[PDB]
Structure formats: structure tokens, C-alpha cells
Design a protein around this ligand. Structure first.
Ligand code: 2BG
Length: 152
């Protein structure tokens, strides 16, 4: 059932990936994956390439994929170790993971989170206040962080 579902998902990611998103097997196992999200336009992350680690837990699809950024990113919801505060990556009642979602849909949500942060549920408190109260300085720091760590 699990193995069977992962094959369906890998196939879909290889053939019909979402715009801007790529995901693939590192080795010869279906539960240790990698992905890549391209920084969107009309965002400070633009022209940046962000790599992620995607671990599929042993009880998938009843527990969510465990995802973290490997490429540094300056964002209120993402910490210095790459942990993402996002509802679709957490179990209910607080979270919104359900088995009718998949790897592609959560990667797309992380992409949306990059365009549209939530300072209501921050992981980086100083970055979160800068985003609310000094928006131009946030945008400047994000673009600098992008150019340094996500390019060449
Ligand atoms: N591994 C992803 C990240 N690494 C870092 C390091 C410093 C600040 C922010 C980030 S996000």
C-alpha cells in the first residue's frame, strides 16, 4: 500500500511536476527524496534556487512528509536549521495533514508560503517583526540572503 502509493507519486512528480517545482530520488529508496523550488517573481527570492530534504515516514500516508530547507532562506516561518512552520506538515487537531494530500501539494504550499508569509505563527521573531513594521528592510535582507546562498 505504502510502496504502491509512493510509485504513483514519484511518477507524477517526474512527468507532471507543478510549475517551479522538482522532486527526485537521491539513492535507491523511495522514502529519502530531494526537491527544488525556484524563487517566485514579485518576491525577494526571485532568480534563486532552493534545495530541500523530503523524508517520508514509515506510516505515510497517515503521517505527513518531513520537509526542511537545505539552502538558507530569510523568512519569518522558516528557522536557521531549515524547519518550516506550515499547517499541512502537521497532524490534526492543530495541523491540516490528511491522506488525500500528497508530496506535490505540500511542496506547492511551501512555495505559496514563500510568496505570502504568516507573521501570526512565526518561527523567527525578529524577522517576523521586521516583516510587519519595516517591510522595505525585510525585502532588502531577503534579496541579499538570496544572492549569497541561493545563487552560483
Ligand atoms: N538549512 C536552511 C537554513 N540554513 C540557515 C542558516 C542561517 C540562517 C537561516 C537559514 S535557513
Amino acid at each position: 500500500q505504502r510502496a504502491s502509493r509512493l510509485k504513483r507519486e514519484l511518477h507524477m512528480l517526474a512527468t507532471e511536476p507543478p510549475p517551479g517545482i522538482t522532486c527526485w530520488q537521491d539513492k535507491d529508496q523511495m522514502d529519502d527524496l530531494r526537491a527544488q523550488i525556484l524563487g517566485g517573481a514579485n518576491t525577494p527570492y526571485e532568480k534563486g534556487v532552493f534545495k530541500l530534504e523530503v523524508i517520508i515516514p514509515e506510516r505515510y500516508p497517515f503521517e505527513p512528509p518531513q520537509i526542511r530547507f537545505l539552502t538558507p532562506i530569510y523568512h519569518p516561518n522558516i528557522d536557521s536549521a531549515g524547519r518550516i512552520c506550515l499547517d499541512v506538515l502537521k497532524l490534526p487537531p492543530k495541523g491540516a495533514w490528511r491522506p488525500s494530500l500528497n508530496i506535490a501539494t505540500v511542496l506547492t504550499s511551501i512555495q505559496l508560503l514563500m510568496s505570502e508569509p504568516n507573521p501570526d505563527d512565526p518561527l523567527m521573531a525578529d524577522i517576523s517583526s521586521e516583516f510587519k513594521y519595516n517591510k522595505p528592510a525585510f525585502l532588502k535582507n531577503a534579496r541579499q540572503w538570496t544572492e549569497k546562498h541561493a545563487r552560483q
